[PDB]
Ligand binder design. Structure first.
Ligand SMILES: O=C(O)CNC(=O)C(=O)O
Ligand code: NI
Ligand SMILES: [Zn+2]
Lengths: 11, 347
């Protein structure tokens, strides 16, 4: 497994 | 129950409003979930904050300049991270001649200008900011503490997933966009527009969501070949004229300041902001979601993508299916029309 972030990868 | 699968709007009294989860079960008993998106207008007596006059020094640490490439109703959005800036700094840019909303009569006119000018004069979106503008004592529909079974993740594991079981703020200007997506793990979302100009939404009924994905894969076959779940990258913009042209059912709705939107498991949505505004959002779950989470097609190709272990949920809420699921033999088919079990109370 659980985790991550909702913010998608910026460029 | 909502056989047209159209976006429904509700006007809860303060007594109905108090229990968040019970009111989601209620709107589902009315068929709201079939559209993928519902609007809830809170009672007039309810305010989440006394005033928004004190937030000008709030830091937007990673504003995104939104570069859009494409034509003929199909676009890819490239999110360029800019230097940190305050809400005051952001509002000045938003309200400036260069970035402010064009003059317009009907919403349909603004909708046309958005789809025409999407790729010009790239705006800045103060998107995915950790925080809440709820005052600490607001106990009804507080995005920081909704009290749903999604709390099992942190309660059990200690794991916080920013924006998913924590709140995010979104400072918009004109022509800032959110691409087509379902929620991470195909969860619900809640979205409250604290202040400012509207936020317009497109929605595809969960029962026709696979048709949107098939279409998107044919239009972006490169992206589809490198990632099954490429729509989760939140880069894909598709106009309602393209949806209409390829027979995808959808509805539209505009959210005004002081309104909540609810998105439902596997409900594809996209949209744009009309001008300077601020929305707060997070994800949440009902018991109905557990099967959606078990079956969610997840993004393979990126680091830091949201994944939730379903184990804890299947053990607690489907203990009879646990050993079968754990063995890979759980063949449950999701019926998108069914309301969450908690709705039984109203049915
Ligand atoms: O407001 C935005 O930019 C996008 N919001 C959402 O996708 C949501 O609340 O589910
Ligand atoms: Ni969303
Ligand atoms: Zn991917």
């Amino acid at each position: 497994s659980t985790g991550g972030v909702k913010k998608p990868h910026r460029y | 129950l909502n056989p047209s699968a159209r976006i429904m709007t509700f006007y809860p009294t303060m007594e109905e409003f108090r229990n968040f989860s019970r009111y989601i079960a209620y709107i589902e008993s009315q068929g709201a979930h079939r559209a993928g998106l519902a609007k809830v207008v809170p009672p007039k007596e309810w305010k989440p904050r006394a005033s928004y006059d004190d937030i000008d020094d709030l830091v937007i640490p990673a504003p995104i300049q939104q570069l859009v490439t494409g034509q003929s109703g199909l676009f890819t959005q490239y999110n360029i991270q800019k230097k940190a800036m305050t809400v005051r700094e952001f509002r000045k840019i938003a309200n400036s001649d260069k970035y402010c909303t064009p003059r317009y009569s009907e919403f349909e006119e603004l909708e046309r200008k958005y789809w025409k000018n999407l790729t010009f004069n790239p705006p800045i979106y103060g998107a995915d900011v950790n925080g809440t503008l709820y005052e600490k004592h607001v106990d009804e529909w507080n995005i920081g503490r909704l009290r749903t079974i999604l709390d099992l993740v942190e309660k059990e594991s200690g794991i916080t997933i920013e924006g998913v079981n924590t709140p995010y703020l979104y400072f918009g200007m004109w022509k800032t966009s959110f691409a087509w997506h379902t929620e991470d793990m195909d969860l619900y979302s809640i979205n409250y527009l604290h202040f400012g100009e509207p936020k317009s939404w497109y929605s595809v009924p969960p029962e026709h969501g696979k048709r949107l994905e098939r279409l998107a894969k044919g239009f972006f076959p490169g992206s589809a070949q490198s990632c099954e779940a490429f729509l989760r990258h939140k880069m894909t913009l598709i106009s309602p004229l393209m949806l209409k042209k390829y027979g995808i059912p959808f509805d539209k709705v505009t959210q005004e300041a002081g309104e909540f939107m609810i998105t439902f498991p596997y409900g594809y949505h996209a949209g744009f902001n009309h001008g300077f505004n601020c929305a707060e959002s997070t994800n949440f779950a009902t018991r109905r979601w557990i099967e959606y989470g078990k079956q969610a097609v997840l993004c393979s190709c990126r680091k830091d993508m949201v994944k939730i272990s379903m184990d804890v949920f299947v053990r607690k809420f489907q203990p009879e299916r646990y050993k079968l699921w754990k063995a890979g033999k759980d063949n449950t088919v999701i019926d998108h029309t069914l309301p969450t079990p908690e709705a039984a109370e109203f049915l």
